[PDB]
Every structure is written in structure tokens, then in C-alpha cells.
Tab-separated table of C-alpha atoms and ligand atoms in Angstrom:
chain	number	residue	atom	x	y	z
A	959	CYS	CA	0.000	0.000	0.000
A	960	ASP	CA	2.844	2.325	0.886
A	961	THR	CA	5.713	3.026	-1.491
A	962	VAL	CA	9.008	4.766	-1.317
A	963	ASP	CA	8.178	7.133	-4.159
A	964	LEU	CA	4.514	7.827	-3.667
A	965	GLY	CA	3.654	7.123	-0.100
A	966	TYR	CA	0.318	5.655	0.874
A	967	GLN	CA	-2.140	4.853	-1.916
A	968	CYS	CA	-4.641	2.382	-0.526
A	969	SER	CA	-8.213	3.621	-0.365
A	970	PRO	CA	-6.969	7.145	-1.139
A	971	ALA	CA	-10.470	8.649	-1.282
A	972	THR	CA	-10.532	8.009	2.479
A	973	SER	CA	-6.938	7.739	3.583
A	974	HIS	CA	-5.936	11.093	2.103
A	975	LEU	CA	-8.622	12.818	4.167
A	976	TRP	CA	-7.284	12.168	7.664
A	977	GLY	CA	-5.461	15.525	8.087
A	978	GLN	CA	-2.317	14.986	10.159
A	979	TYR	CA	-3.364	11.374	10.662
A	980	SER	CA	-3.051	10.628	6.917
A	981	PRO	CA	0.009	8.533	6.035
A	982	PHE	CA	2.254	10.653	3.789
A	983	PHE	CA	1.081	10.604	0.158
A	984	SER	CA	2.968	12.197	-2.694
A	985	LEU	CA	1.668	15.520	-4.029
A	986	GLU	CA	4.041	15.654	-7.000
A	987	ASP	CA	2.402	17.774	-9.770
A	988	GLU	CA	-0.657	18.621	-7.585
A	989	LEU	CA	-1.203	22.318	-8.294
A	990	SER	CA	2.526	22.360	-8.959
A	991	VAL	CA	5.267	21.974	-11.520
A	992	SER	CA	7.527	18.913	-11.714
A	993	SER	CA	9.670	18.200	-8.664
A	994	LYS	CA	12.423	16.793	-10.912
A	995	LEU	CA	15.893	18.297	-10.733
A	996	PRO	CA	15.825	20.824	-13.634
A	997	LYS	CA	18.180	20.344	-16.656
A	998	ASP	CA	21.748	21.560	-16.073
A	999	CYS	CA	21.233	22.053	-12.337
A	1000	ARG	CA	23.218	20.607	-9.452
A	1001	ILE	CA	21.978	20.405	-5.888
A	1002	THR	CA	24.454	22.115	-3.568
A	1003	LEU	CA	22.573	21.876	-0.251
A	1004	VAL	CA	19.478	20.104	0.984
A	1005	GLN	CA	17.697	20.597	4.314
A	1006	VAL	CA	15.135	17.881	5.168
A	1007	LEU	CA	12.437	18.609	7.766
A	1008	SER	CA	10.624	15.372	8.603
A	1009	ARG	CA	7.780	14.508	10.948
A	1010	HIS	CA	7.833	11.224	12.871
A	1011	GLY	CA	5.994	8.273	11.271
A	1012	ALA	CA	2.584	6.753	11.929
A	1013	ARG	CA	2.072	6.267	15.634
A	1014	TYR	CA	-0.352	5.153	18.307
A	1015	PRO	CA	-2.499	7.873	19.910
A	1016	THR	CA	-0.722	9.931	22.600
A	1017	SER	CA	-1.252	8.296	25.974
A	1018	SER	CA	-4.013	10.751	26.937
A	1019	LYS	CA	-5.866	10.223	23.621
A	1020	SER	CA	-5.405	6.431	23.723
A	1021	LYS	CA	-6.977	6.462	27.207
A	1022	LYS	CA	-9.888	8.582	25.918
A	1023	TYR	CA	-10.483	6.246	22.958
A	1024	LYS	CA	-10.316	3.047	25.009
A	1025	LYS	CA	-12.826	4.606	27.472
A	1026	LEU	CA	-15.181	5.409	24.551
A	1027	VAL	CA	-14.980	1.951	22.972
A	1028	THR	CA	-15.437	0.354	26.434
A	1029	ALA	CA	-18.457	2.505	27.166
A	1030	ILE	CA	-20.045	1.748	23.773
A	1031	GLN	CA	-19.508	-1.985	24.362
A	1032	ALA	CA	-21.014	-1.699	27.831
A	1033	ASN	CA	-24.059	0.441	26.903
A	1034	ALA	CA	-25.214	-0.694	23.429
A	1035	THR	CA	-28.152	-3.107	23.372
A	1036	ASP	CA	-27.476	-3.669	19.688
A	1037	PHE	CA	-24.603	-2.976	17.324
A	1038	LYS	CA	-26.428	-2.348	14.116
A	1039	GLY	CA	-25.374	-2.235	10.468
A	1040	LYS	CA	-21.856	-0.932	9.914
A	1041	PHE	CA	-21.344	-0.622	13.676
A	1042	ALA	CA	-21.713	-4.372	14.257
A	1043	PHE	CA	-17.918	-4.894	14.574
A	1044	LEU	CA	-18.040	-2.762	17.743
A	1045	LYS	CA	-19.526	-5.867	19.365
A	1046	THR	CA	-16.212	-7.698	19.442
A	1047	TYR	CA	-13.694	-4.963	18.734
A	1048	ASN	CA	-10.696	-5.265	21.036
A	1049	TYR	CA	-8.896	-1.988	21.678
A	1050	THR	CA	-5.227	-2.986	21.570
A	1051	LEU	CA	-3.565	0.328	20.673
A	1052	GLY	CA	-0.656	1.555	22.739
A	1053	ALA	CA	0.505	5.071	23.352
A	1054	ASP	CA	2.872	7.491	21.717
A	1055	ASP	CA	5.146	5.001	19.973
A	1056	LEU	CA	5.641	4.456	16.275
A	1057	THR	CA	3.729	1.558	14.799
A	1058	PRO	CA	5.541	-1.002	12.572
A	1059	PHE	CA	3.977	0.779	9.598
A	1060	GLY	CA	5.202	4.161	10.815
A	1061	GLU	CA	8.727	2.758	11.280
A	1062	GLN	CA	8.641	1.544	7.694
A	1063	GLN	CA	7.416	4.916	6.434
A	1064	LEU	CA	10.603	6.440	7.859
A	1065	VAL	CA	12.851	3.727	6.436
A	1066	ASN	CA	11.156	4.517	3.071
A	1067	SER	CA	11.680	8.249	3.584
A	1068	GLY	CA	15.423	7.671	4.147
A	1069	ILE	CA	15.626	5.578	0.942
A	1070	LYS	CA	13.680	8.236	-0.948
A	1071	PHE	CA	16.015	10.942	0.303
A	1072	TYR	CA	19.114	8.968	-0.804
A	1073	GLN	CA	17.494	8.242	-4.184
A	1074	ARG	CA	16.407	11.846	-4.869
A	1075	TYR	CA	19.738	13.377	-3.811
A	1076	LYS	CA	22.045	10.540	-4.872
A	1077	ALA	CA	24.677	12.659	-6.567
A	1078	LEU	CA	25.253	14.546	-3.295
A	1079	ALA	CA	24.423	11.736	-0.862
A	1080	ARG	CA	27.144	9.538	-2.370
A	1081	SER	CA	29.788	11.602	-0.600
A	1082	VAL	CA	27.898	13.171	2.307
A	1083	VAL	CA	27.109	12.043	5.803
A	1084	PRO	CA	24.128	14.237	6.754
A	1085	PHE	CA	24.068	16.253	9.952
A	1086	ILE	CA	21.012	15.159	11.881
A	1087	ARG	CA	19.043	16.494	14.831
A	1088	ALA	CA	15.870	15.216	16.448
A	1089	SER	CA	13.511	16.854	18.867
A	1090	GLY	CA	13.591	14.977	22.143
A	1091	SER	CA	10.477	12.791	21.776
A	1092	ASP	CA	10.878	8.983	21.585
A	1093	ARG	CA	8.782	8.675	18.404
A	1094	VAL	CA	10.709	11.552	16.774
A	1095	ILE	CA	14.114	10.056	17.644
A	1096	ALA	CA	12.973	6.601	16.562
A	1097	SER	CA	11.862	8.195	13.303
A	1098	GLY	CA	15.362	9.597	12.854
A	1099	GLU	CA	16.903	6.169	13.474
A	1100	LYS	CA	14.593	4.568	10.909
A	1101	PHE	CA	15.292	7.309	8.365
A	1102	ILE	CA	19.008	6.649	8.898
A	1103	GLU	CA	18.377	2.894	8.398
A	1104	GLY	CA	16.806	3.531	5.036
A	1105	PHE	CA	19.387	6.108	3.962
A	1106	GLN	CA	22.189	3.631	4.700
A	1107	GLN	CA	20.297	0.766	3.068
A	1108	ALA	CA	20.110	2.769	-0.156
A	1109	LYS	CA	23.726	4.071	0.177
A	1110	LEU	CA	25.258	0.649	0.829
A	1111	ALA	CA	23.341	-0.632	-2.274
A	1112	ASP	CA	24.877	2.095	-4.447
A	1113	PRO	CA	28.229	1.199	-6.078
A	1114	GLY	CA	28.889	4.877	-6.586
A	1115	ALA	CA	28.834	5.737	-2.844
A	1116	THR	CA	32.215	6.938	-1.637
A	1117	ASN	CA	31.510	8.212	1.997
A	1118	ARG	CA	29.598	5.428	3.685
A	1119	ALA	CA	29.985	6.128	7.437
A	1120	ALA	CA	26.444	6.057	8.987
A	1121	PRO	CA	25.290	9.456	10.302
A	1122	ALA	CA	24.390	9.516	13.982
A	1123	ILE	CA	21.732	11.751	15.485
A	1124	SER	CA	24.115	14.423	16.773
A	1125	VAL	CA	21.649	16.547	18.705
A	1126	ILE	CA	18.658	15.441	20.720
A	1127	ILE	CA	16.985	18.754	21.494
A	1128	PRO	CA	15.376	18.513	24.929
A	1129	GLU	CA	11.642	19.007	25.075
A	1130	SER	CA	10.340	21.107	27.972
A	1131	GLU	CA	8.709	24.485	28.818
A	1132	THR	CA	12.130	25.979	29.588
A	1133	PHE	CA	14.379	24.608	26.857
A	1134	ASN	CA	14.637	26.689	23.671
A	1135	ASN	CA	13.908	24.045	21.002
A	1136	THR	CA	13.314	25.121	17.338
A	1137	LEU	CA	11.847	21.697	16.549
A	1138	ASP	CA	9.209	21.805	19.261
A	1139	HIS	CA	7.413	24.720	20.915
A	1140	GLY	CA	7.122	25.491	24.615
A	1141	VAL	CA	8.814	28.756	25.602
A	1142	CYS	CA	6.358	31.276	24.182
A	1143	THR	CA	4.216	31.841	27.245
A	1144	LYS	CA	1.222	33.557	25.622
A	1145	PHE	CA	1.037	31.126	22.738
A	1146	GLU	CA	1.131	28.099	24.992
A	1147	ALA	CA	-1.881	29.588	26.788
A	1148	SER	CA	-3.742	30.112	23.502
A	1149	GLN	CA	-7.132	28.477	23.085
A	1150	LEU	CA	-8.080	29.752	19.612
A	1151	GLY	CA	-7.269	26.511	17.761
A	1152	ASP	CA	-9.349	24.386	20.122
A	1153	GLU	CA	-12.153	26.971	20.055
A	1154	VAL	CA	-12.291	27.079	16.252
A	1155	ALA	CA	-12.202	23.261	16.075
A	1156	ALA	CA	-15.001	22.869	18.697
A	1157	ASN	CA	-17.114	25.390	16.766
A	1158	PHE	CA	-16.749	23.637	13.430
A	1159	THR	CA	-17.234	20.193	15.093
A	1160	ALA	CA	-20.570	21.510	16.457
A	1161	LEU	CA	-21.582	22.212	12.825
A	1162	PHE	CA	-20.959	18.757	11.401
A	1163	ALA	CA	-20.880	16.212	14.244
A	1164	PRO	CA	-24.621	16.337	15.252
A	1165	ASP	CA	-25.878	14.536	12.100
A	1166	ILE	CA	-23.210	11.860	12.597
A	1167	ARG	CA	-24.014	11.648	16.287
A	1168	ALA	CA	-27.676	10.965	15.415
A	1169	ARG	CA	-26.836	8.192	12.948
A	1170	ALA	CA	-24.360	6.455	15.276
A	1171	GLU	CA	-26.758	6.538	18.247
A	1172	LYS	CA	-29.455	5.103	15.953
A	1173	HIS	CA	-27.162	2.102	15.324
A	1174	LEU	CA	-26.011	1.783	18.934
A	1175	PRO	CA	-29.224	1.954	21.001
A	1176	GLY	CA	-28.248	2.516	24.657
A	1177	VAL	CA	-25.282	4.679	23.635
A	1178	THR	CA	-25.048	8.422	24.217
A	1179	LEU	CA	-22.324	10.268	22.311
A	1180	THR	CA	-20.821	13.740	22.437
A	1181	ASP	CA	-19.531	15.768	19.491
A	1182	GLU	CA	-16.097	14.862	20.771
A	1183	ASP	CA	-16.830	11.099	20.695
A	1184	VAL	CA	-17.796	11.476	17.031
A	1185	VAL	CA	-14.353	12.993	16.325
A	1186	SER	CA	-12.831	10.221	18.484
A	1187	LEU	CA	-14.504	7.533	16.368
A	1188	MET	CA	-13.226	9.255	13.222
A	1189	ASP	CA	-9.659	9.546	14.661
A	1190	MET	CA	-9.881	5.773	15.265
A	1191	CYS	CA	-10.159	5.104	11.546
A	1192	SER	CA	-6.560	6.283	10.973
A	1193	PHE	CA	-5.044	5.043	14.234
A	1194	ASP	CA	-6.539	1.561	13.888
A	1195	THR	CA	-5.540	1.346	10.198
A	1196	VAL	CA	-1.942	2.213	10.903
A	1197	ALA	CA	-1.700	-0.249	13.857
A	1198	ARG	CA	-3.781	-3.193	12.851
A	1199	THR	CA	-1.360	-4.577	10.264
A	1200	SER	CA	2.388	-4.026	9.913
A	1201	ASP	CA	1.907	-2.505	6.393
A	1202	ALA	CA	-1.416	-0.737	6.921
A	1203	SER	CA	-2.797	-3.028	4.213
A	1204	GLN	CA	-6.293	-3.177	5.689
A	1205	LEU	CA	-8.543	-0.145	6.275
A	1206	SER	CA	-9.999	-0.009	9.761
A	1207	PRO	CA	-13.674	-0.942	10.187
A	1208	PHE	CA	-14.045	2.494	11.878
A	1209	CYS	CA	-13.482	4.044	8.431
A	1210	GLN	CA	-16.648	3.012	6.683
A	1211	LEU	CA	-18.808	4.285	9.543
A	1212	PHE	CA	-18.430	7.686	7.853
A	1213	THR	CA	-19.210	8.865	4.371
A	1214	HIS	CA	-16.888	10.513	1.904
A	1215	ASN	CA	-18.448	13.875	2.454
A	1216	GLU	CA	-17.965	13.374	6.209
A	1217	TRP	CA	-14.283	12.561	5.698
A	1218	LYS	CA	-13.967	15.867	3.786
A	1219	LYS	CA	-15.389	17.626	6.799
A	1220	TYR	CA	-13.067	15.708	9.164
A	1221	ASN	CA	-10.008	16.474	7.032
A	1222	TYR	CA	-11.076	20.145	7.128
A	1223	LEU	CA	-11.532	20.016	10.930
A	1224	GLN	CA	-7.941	18.918	11.057
A	1225	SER	CA	-6.792	21.707	8.728
A	1226	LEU	CA	-8.627	24.268	10.936
A	1227	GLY	CA	-6.968	22.830	14.060
A	1228	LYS	CA	-3.529	23.322	12.559
A	1229	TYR	CA	-4.220	26.663	10.873
A	1230	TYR	CA	-5.806	28.327	13.913
A	1231	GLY	CA	-3.536	26.538	16.350
A	1232	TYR	CA	-0.111	26.817	14.705
A	1233	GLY	CA	-0.426	28.503	11.318
A	1234	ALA	CA	-1.294	32.082	10.304
A	1235	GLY	CA	-4.736	31.714	11.947
A	1236	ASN	CA	-3.054	31.980	15.333
A	1237	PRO	CA	-1.672	35.452	16.178
A	1238	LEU	CA	1.459	33.727	17.546
A	1239	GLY	CA	1.379	30.697	15.251
A	1240	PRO	CA	4.109	31.515	12.737
A	1241	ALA	CA	6.276	32.938	15.508
A	1242	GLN	CA	6.773	29.389	16.731
A	1243	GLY	CA	8.583	28.722	13.459
A	1244	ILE	CA	10.962	31.720	13.463
A	1245	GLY	CA	13.665	29.808	15.369
A	1246	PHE	CA	14.049	27.106	12.708
A	1247	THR	CA	13.590	29.641	9.923
A	1248	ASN	CA	16.617	31.512	11.239
A	1249	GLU	CA	18.500	28.210	11.513
A	1250	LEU	CA	17.628	27.453	7.896
A	1251	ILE	CA	18.798	30.955	6.737
A	1252	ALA	CA	22.027	30.310	8.664
A	1253	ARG	CA	22.503	27.006	6.831
A	1254	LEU	CA	21.572	28.295	3.376
A	1255	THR	CA	24.009	31.243	3.710
A	1256	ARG	CA	26.715	29.396	5.724
A	1257	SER	CA	26.455	32.150	8.335
A	1258	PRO	CA	26.026	32.281	12.159
A	1259	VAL	CA	22.440	32.155	13.381
A	1260	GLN	CA	20.755	35.464	13.936
A	1261	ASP	CA	17.805	34.699	16.244
A	1262	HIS	CA	16.229	35.795	19.507
A	1263	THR	CA	13.254	33.456	19.658
A	1264	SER	CA	13.326	29.747	20.248
A	1265	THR	CA	16.927	28.945	19.273
A	1266	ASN	CA	19.330	27.943	22.029
A	1267	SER	CA	22.347	30.262	21.760
A	1268	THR	CA	24.738	27.636	23.134
A	1269	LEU	CA	23.449	25.000	20.657
A	1270	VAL	CA	23.653	27.299	17.613
A	1271	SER	CA	26.961	29.071	18.009
A	1272	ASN	CA	28.958	25.904	18.561
A	1273	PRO	CA	30.053	24.110	15.326
A	1274	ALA	CA	29.599	20.687	16.984
A	1275	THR	CA	25.840	21.055	17.462
A	1276	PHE	CA	25.292	23.549	14.592
A	1277	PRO	CA	27.772	23.184	11.674
A	1278	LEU	CA	27.443	25.711	8.830
A	1279	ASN	CA	29.055	23.580	6.120
A	1280	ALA	CA	27.385	20.145	6.338
A	1281	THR	CA	25.762	20.270	2.850
A	1282	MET	CA	22.964	17.872	3.939
A	1283	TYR	CA	20.847	18.511	7.019
A	1284	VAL	CA	18.014	16.369	8.342
A	1285	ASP	CA	15.798	17.456	11.260
A	1286	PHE	CA	13.052	15.408	12.876
A	1287	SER	CA	10.117	17.202	14.428
A	1288	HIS	CA	6.371	17.287	15.020
A	1289	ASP	CA	3.383	18.297	12.966
A	1290	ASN	CA	2.602	21.457	14.971
A	1291	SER	CA	6.084	22.930	14.804
A	1292	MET	CA	6.352	22.048	11.122
A	1293	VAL	CA	3.109	23.978	10.454
A	1294	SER	CA	4.529	27.073	12.262
A	1295	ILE	CA	7.790	26.724	10.343
A	1296	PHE	CA	6.137	26.511	6.935
A	1297	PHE	CA	4.032	29.593	7.699
A	1298	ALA	CA	7.009	31.542	9.111
A	1299	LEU	CA	8.912	30.769	5.863
A	1300	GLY	CA	5.935	32.378	4.003
A	1301	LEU	CA	5.271	29.123	2.031
A	1302	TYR	CA	1.516	29.492	2.509
A	1303	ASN	CA	1.340	33.238	1.901
A	1304	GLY	CA	-1.039	32.478	-0.964
A	1305	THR	CA	-3.550	30.952	1.444
A	1306	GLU	CA	-6.336	33.151	2.910
A	1307	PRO	CA	-7.734	32.634	6.438
A	1308	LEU	CA	-9.744	29.440	6.502
A	1309	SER	CA	-13.542	29.638	6.617
A	1310	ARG	CA	-14.487	28.722	10.151
A	1311	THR	CA	-17.897	27.542	8.962
A	1312	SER	CA	-17.476	26.047	5.466
A	1313	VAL	CA	-15.138	23.426	4.021
A	1314	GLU	CA	-12.500	24.719	1.615
A	1315	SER	CA	-10.385	22.197	-0.280
A	1316	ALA	CA	-6.594	22.067	-0.199
A	1317	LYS	CA	-6.640	23.405	-3.771
A	1318	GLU	CA	-9.014	26.270	-2.920
A	1319	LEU	CA	-6.524	27.063	-0.185
A	1320	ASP	CA	-3.603	26.983	-2.684
A	1321	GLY	CA	-2.102	23.712	-1.383
A	1322	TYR	CA	-2.771	24.014	2.324
A	1323	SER	CA	-4.282	21.243	4.321
A	1324	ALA	CA	-3.122	19.180	7.275
A	1325	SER	CA	-2.963	16.044	5.071
A	1326	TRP	CA	-1.020	17.806	2.282
A	1327	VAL	CA	1.404	19.508	4.672
A	1328	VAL	CA	1.813	17.458	7.887
A	1329	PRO	CA	0.730	13.849	7.315
A	1330	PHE	CA	2.331	11.012	9.319
A	1331	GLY	CA	5.900	10.841	7.901
A	1332	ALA	CA	5.607	14.320	6.334
A	1333	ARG	CA	8.798	15.627	4.733
A	1334	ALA	CA	9.939	18.960	3.432
A	1335	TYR	CA	13.021	19.410	1.280
A	1336	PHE	CA	14.650	22.839	1.037
A	1337	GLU	CA	17.171	22.798	-1.821
A	1338	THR	CA	19.937	25.041	-2.997
A	1339	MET	CA	21.015	24.389	-6.580
A	1340	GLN	CA	23.552	25.775	-9.029
A	1341	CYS	CA	22.191	25.953	-12.589
A	1342	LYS	CA	24.019	26.650	-15.874
A	1343	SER	CA	21.159	29.106	-16.538
A	1344	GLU	CA	21.899	31.336	-13.499
A	1345	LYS	CA	24.999	32.630	-11.681
A	1346	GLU	CA	23.294	32.869	-8.243
A	1347	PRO	CA	22.253	29.803	-6.220
A	1348	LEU	CA	18.553	29.014	-6.552
A	1349	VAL	CA	16.335	27.847	-3.665
A	1350	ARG	CA	13.379	25.495	-4.055
A	1351	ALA	CA	10.912	24.161	-1.440
A	1352	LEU	CA	9.208	20.796	-1.798
A	1353	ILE	CA	6.513	19.805	0.732
A	1354	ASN	CA	5.546	16.142	0.459
A	1355	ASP	CA	6.880	16.317	-3.136
A	1356	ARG	CA	4.834	19.330	-4.137
A	1357	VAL	CA	6.894	22.251	-5.369
A	1358	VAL	CA	5.532	25.023	-3.140
A	1359	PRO	CA	6.204	28.337	-4.885
A	1360	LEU	CA	8.179	30.683	-2.597
A	1361	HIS	CA	6.812	33.979	-1.370
A	1362	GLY	CA	8.624	37.198	-0.685
A	1363	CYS	CA	10.968	36.902	-3.684
A	1364	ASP	CA	10.678	36.978	-7.527
A	1365	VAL	CA	9.931	33.315	-8.180
A	1366	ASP	CA	10.709	31.722	-11.571
A	1367	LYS	CA	8.559	29.333	-13.657
A	1368	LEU	CA	9.996	26.396	-11.649
A	1369	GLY	CA	9.010	27.881	-8.292
A	1370	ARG	CA	12.584	28.902	-7.375
A	1371	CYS	CA	14.194	32.088	-6.060
A	1372	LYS	CA	17.740	33.330	-6.056
A	1373	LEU	CA	19.265	32.612	-2.636
A	1374	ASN	CA	19.914	36.218	-1.638
A	1375	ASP	CA	16.479	37.245	-2.866
A	1376	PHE	CA	14.771	34.509	-0.843
A	1377	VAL	CA	16.628	35.452	2.315
A	1378	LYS	CA	15.748	39.092	1.701
A	1379	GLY	CA	12.070	38.127	1.638
A	1380	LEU	CA	12.220	36.472	5.092
A	1381	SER	CA	12.337	39.870	6.788
A	1382	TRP	CA	9.536	38.914	9.232
A	1383	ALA	CA	11.357	35.883	10.682
A	1384	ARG	CA	14.763	37.612	10.531
A	1385	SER	CA	13.440	40.402	12.782
A	1386	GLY	CA	11.857	37.968	15.231
A	1387	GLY	CA	8.291	38.433	14.050
A	1388	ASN	CA	5.931	39.215	16.922
A	1389	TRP	CA	7.866	36.976	19.346
A	1390	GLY	CA	7.949	39.706	21.991
A	1391	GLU	CA	4.208	39.322	22.387
A	1392	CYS	CA	5.001	35.902	23.881
A	1393	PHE	CA	5.664	37.585	27.209
B	77	NAG	C1	20.673	25.827	26.048
B	77	NAG	O1	21.334	24.583	25.913
B	77	NAG	C2	22.235	24.257	26.976
B	77	NAG	C3	23.006	22.973	26.642
B	77	NAG	O2	22.156	21.854	26.396
B	77	NAG	C4	21.517	24.219	28.341
B	77	NAG	O3	22.453	24.118	29.399
B	77	NAG	C5	20.661	25.474	28.549
B	77	NAG	O4	19.805	25.262	29.649
B	77	NAG	C6	19.815	25.780	27.310
B	77	NAG	N1	19.055	27.011	27.512
B	77	NAG	C7	17.810	27.126	27.017
B	77	NAG	C8	16.961	28.242	27.564
B	77	NAG	O5	17.352	26.354	26.153
B	78	NAG	C1	-17.836	30.134	17.858
B	78	NAG	O1	-19.135	30.500	17.418
B	78	NAG	C2	-19.752	31.483	18.240
B	78	NAG	C3	-21.220	31.650	17.850
B	78	NAG	O2	-21.326	31.923	16.467
B	78	NAG	C4	-18.958	32.785	18.113
B	78	NAG	O3	-19.499	33.818	18.921
B	78	NAG	C5	-17.495	32.548	18.485
B	78	NAG	O4	-16.746	33.711	18.213
B	78	NAG	C6	-16.915	31.354	17.717
B	78	NAG	N1	-15.569	31.040	18.186
B	78	NAG	C7	-14.459	31.232	17.459
B	78	NAG	C8	-13.175	31.168	18.231
B	78	NAG	O5	-14.437	31.448	16.236
B	79	NAG	C1	15.861	31.234	25.173
B	79	NAG	O1	14.917	31.994	24.459
B	79	NAG	C2	14.587	33.300	24.943
B	79	NAG	C3	13.888	33.965	23.758
B	79	NAG	O2	12.521	33.707	23.870
B	79	NAG	C4	15.788	34.195	25.221
B	79	NAG	O3	15.419	35.265	26.077
B	79	NAG	C5	16.937	33.454	25.855
B	79	NAG	O4	18.091	34.237	25.584
B	79	NAG	C6	17.145	32.095	25.222
B	79	NAG	N1	18.250	31.441	25.892
B	79	NAG	C7	19.145	30.749	25.172
B	79	NAG	C8	20.100	29.879	25.939
B	79	NAG	O5	19.205	30.812	23.930
B	80	NAG	C1	3.880	36.454	4.522
B	80	NAG	O1	2.832	37.349	4.850
B	80	NAG	C2	2.985	38.064	6.044
B	80	NAG	C3	1.704	38.863	6.245
B	80	NAG	O2	1.500	39.689	5.118
B	80	NAG	C4	4.226	38.956	5.917
B	80	NAG	O3	4.451	39.660	7.112
B	80	NAG	C5	5.440	38.075	5.656
B	80	NAG	O4	6.595	38.877	5.510
B	80	NAG	C6	5.205	37.236	4.406
B	80	NAG	N1	6.357	36.356	4.271
B	80	NAG	C7	7.056	36.252	3.145
B	80	NAG	C8	8.231	35.316	3.158
B	80	NAG	O5	6.782	36.924	2.144
């Protein structure tokens, strides 16, 4: 079901509508030009920003889901129609960890990275950091597994030493971590994302609630339980077989049009929680943006937000000449980063009441941008057609045209021009409002 090149393509009319719970699927050519390396170009630097792979629910969510399934199985005097499987369903999910499928997604991502950047990877041991979350680190290890598998299979590889994860960035409310959020006091207190999501849930869940209660006499559900039962479609699918070869029976409880609404609920959550919808959303991504500028221009980090000054100004934990960088992070931080970089500056504020498709929103959705195993590639290339280095961003294989600079027909900008456009991040955005 899942491939190195294209990601997850089983039951795609459903599985591509799980927002951040969708397994990565390739968006090559979707509202985009070709992601191929252009004629007479040579990649000179690549930054990878990867999410962890498919996982179990977080321990608090897994507890909530188990409680819901237990309650339904206790209270229902019948399990009717499509809900009949709830009779005998055994909740077996764990918490937090990668599933076998999610491990394999990251092995595949490592292969894919080696394959796409072979000419550089042949001679490069990437410099790798991971935010300090078990599933994120494990994702890094699996990515490395795949990268080495591909490299050791390539007769043209010259520098074959395995990369280690050099930096495990601690996760806490006091540690400045560009790959996770936590230090921006006001933002961490923000409730806008949850409020927007509850509001939109109140619009669409009631009809579903009615139908489910009709099939589960004895059962009372909340709007939240409806969302819980929809979350279970993805979590169960990615856990129930090692290869996610079998769609969860939770999935066909809901119609296609309902999955569109769910996918949108997820997009709203991310947009209003971490993206431009939140007044302090993009500010959470300034830290990494400034790290990326530093890497693209081989220059010391200029940042006063969520970088750690001792991590960044020491060559051991922040080299400026590594040529390949790979960072492992979380959906929420990756959303803030992509917005801080201006990559979704063509996207207007999401309707809080009405579904808008990823294409209506110019390529933005949770499933297009931060699926399980999401990856972004930020390239620098040297082309016979141009004296200046050219920068290109690819998000889950979609060429995302840059903003803030004069972009060419291939969605690229000249390096200095791109950096010039990032004036908001370079000046620390509205970070001061954190306090
Ligand atoms: C920065 O990192 C160093 C080394 O890991 C640590 O001692 C210090 O507490 C960090 N400061 C912040 C605020 O992240
Ligand atoms: C939720 O909807 C109510 C009623 O229409 C509205 O007053 C409120 O502002 C909405 N919440 C958000 C955060 O959009
Ligand atoms: C941690 O971040 C805050 C910026 O929000 C800053 O005041 C402090 O200097 C930082 N400390 C380190 C070690 O970078
Ligand atoms: C994206 O839009 C915001 C709001 O207009 C602006 O402040 C920011 O500089 C833009 N970013 C880029 C890279 O153009």
C-alpha cells in the first residue's frame, strides 16, 4: 500500500482525508510543476524537515479512545449495520510510539532521500538532529536505516559512514527548542485553535451523532466522541497490520463527504492553532527559519526566539558547512515553520464555517502539509542558466512556490532574494508578544 516514491495509496479517497493522521502521500504535480531536478542544475545543499511516522495515539488520547470503545460496548443493546464490529472490537492500541507501519514509512523516507539526492548523498554524511520525543528520535533512526540501506546498495557511494543523530533537542517548557514549541508563554496559553475546532465540530458532528446513536441503542455520544470515532479510523488502520494493508472498520462508519469535513476540521486545528490563523502561530517557526537561513548562507544564526544560543553558536551542534541537514520534528512545529517561511502566503484565512479544499486554499491542508511521515526538502542548486544559487521548497513532493521573492517558472528564487524576503522571521516576528 505504501511506497518509497509515492507514499500511501490504498483507499486514497478516504486515507488522504485524515489531516495529520493521513500517512504521507505524494503531491508531486498537484497544483505544482515537476519536482524533478531541472536540466543543467546541481543540488548544492538540501535541508530535510521530517515529521515522525505513523504512531499510536498519545497516551491521553489512547486512554480517551479506550474509554469510549469500552463505554459503547457496555451500553449498546445492539450494534447495528456498519457498527456491528463494535460488538467484538478489542482496543489494543498503545501510546505514543511508532507503529511497525510508521517505522517503515521512515525507512522509506530515508531511501527516498538517498534516491532523490544521490549525486550529493554519495559523498555526504548528513548532519542530523531530532527533537527529544521517543517517536521523533525513533523516526530519525529509521530514516538513517533507510538512507544507509540505499547508500550501501549504491556502487557509486564513496563516503559510507552512517550518520548519527548528533543533537537530541530537549523538550520542555524551559528549553529553547526550534523543533518543538514550549517557551512562548502567551502562545502556549492560547485556546483559539481548540475553540475554532469545537465550533466547526458543532456544525458537522450532530448529524453523525444521530446516525451512530441510531445504530447503537443505549449509547449516548458527544460531538467529541464522534471525532474520536473518526480519529480511530486512521489510528486503527496504521496499527492493525504491519503494512497498513487493511482499512480499519471504523473508516466506513463515515461517508466521503464526512471525511472531507473531518479532514477540514484537522486543517482548521492546525491553521488556527499553529499557522497564520493563530496570532502567535508563525512565531513558533521563526527559530528554525533563522537556523535554515544560517545554513543556506553558511552564516552564524541570527535569532532571539526559540533557538538555544549555546546549541547554535557551537560548530559541533550547529555546523554551517554540512551540505545535507536532516531534522526530525512534530506536525505542529512544522506547520509554524512553513508559515514563518511564508510558504503558505497564498492561502487566505480558513472559513471557520465552510469546508474549503486544499486546492481552494492553494495547497494548504493538514494532510497535504503534515501527514504522518511528512517531509519537506529545502534545496539550494547551481544551474548553468543562473549565476546565483537558486532555492526550491518541496513539501511532500509538491513544489511550493516561494513567497517574498521573484519566483521563476519552476518555483525557485535566487538565494539572496529569498533570504531578503524572510524579513519577518529575521526580525523575530511578533515573538515579543510571547511575554
Ligand atoms: C541551552 O542549551 C544548553 C546545553 O544543552 C543548556 O544548558 C541550557 O539550559 C539551554 N538554555 C535554554 C533556555 O534552552
Ligand atoms: C464560535 O461560534 C460562536 C457563535 O457563532 C462565536 O461567537 C465565536 O466567536 C466562535 N468562536 C471562534 C473562536 O471562532
Ligand atoms: C531562550 O529563548 C529566549 C527567547 O525567547 C531568550 O530570552 C533566551 O536568551 C534564550 N536562551 C538561550 C540559551 O538561547
Ligand atoms: C507572509 O505574509 C505576512 C503577512 O502579510 C508577511 O508579514 C510576511 O513577511 C510574508 N512572508 C514572506 C516570506 O513573504
